């Protein structure tokens, strides 16, 4: 039996469409939290970005004259 059209009220819902929609919403947040738990660097950062001012003049070769 199909979904009957209704008037000025909430339409009929199937159990299957609701559990599939909740299942794919859970799949979205599962995959987001999973790849955020394992990678954590594609969003935040892979390697440290060094400070240029914190480098010494000997490794860069600046003789003071």
């Amino acid at each position: 039996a199909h979904i009957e059209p209704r008037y000025r009220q909430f339409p009929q819902l199937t159990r299957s469409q609701v559990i599939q929609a909740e299942f794919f919403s859970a799949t979205m947040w599962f995959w987001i939290l999973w790849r955020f738990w394992h990678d954590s660097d594609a969003v935040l950062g892979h390697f440290p970005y060094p400070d240029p001012s914190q480098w010494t003049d000997e490794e860069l070769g600046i003789p003071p004259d």
Binding site: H46, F47, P50, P52, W55, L60, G61, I62, P63, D65
Partner: protein, 122 residues
């Protein structure tokens, strides 16, 4: 990104221009500076068919990673550490580029303070 403000709003006389640099010799300030060693042979990266942008000073990690990527088919998640090695050494190459940039900026500061010392003294 602050150096963009230092070069545009400030002066471009002390900021090293991006297009043609180093303007200083490589031995200037370095006693017995050594070259950059290339690990992968020219013929080895020739046969590996690498992109001309990818044949830099650390393409040997890329050759090991691509051999792992070919050999681990279909398990395409089995060579994460070889990609990590290649990305880390590209990161170190970028750090060496940053060190060249900071060297050029500090030698232009040396030239700026040198001519200011000469204008104060003489």
């Amino acid at each position: 990104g602050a150096h963009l403000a230092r070069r545009y709003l400030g002066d471009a006389s002390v900021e090293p221009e991006p297009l043609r640099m180093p303007t200083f010799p490589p031995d200037y300030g370095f006693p017995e500076r050594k070259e950059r060693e290339m690990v992968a042979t020219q013929q080895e990266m020739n046969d590996a068919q690498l992109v001309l942008q990818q044949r830099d000073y650390c393409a040997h990690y890329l050759i090991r990673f691509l051999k792992c990527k070919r050999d681990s088919f279909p398990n395409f998640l089995a060579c994460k550490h070889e990609q990590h090695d290649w990305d880390y050494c590209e990161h170190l190459d970028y750090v060496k580029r940053m060190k060249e940039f900071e060297r050029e900026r500090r030698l232009l500061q040396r030239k700026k303070r040198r001519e200011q010392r000469e204008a104060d003294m003489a």
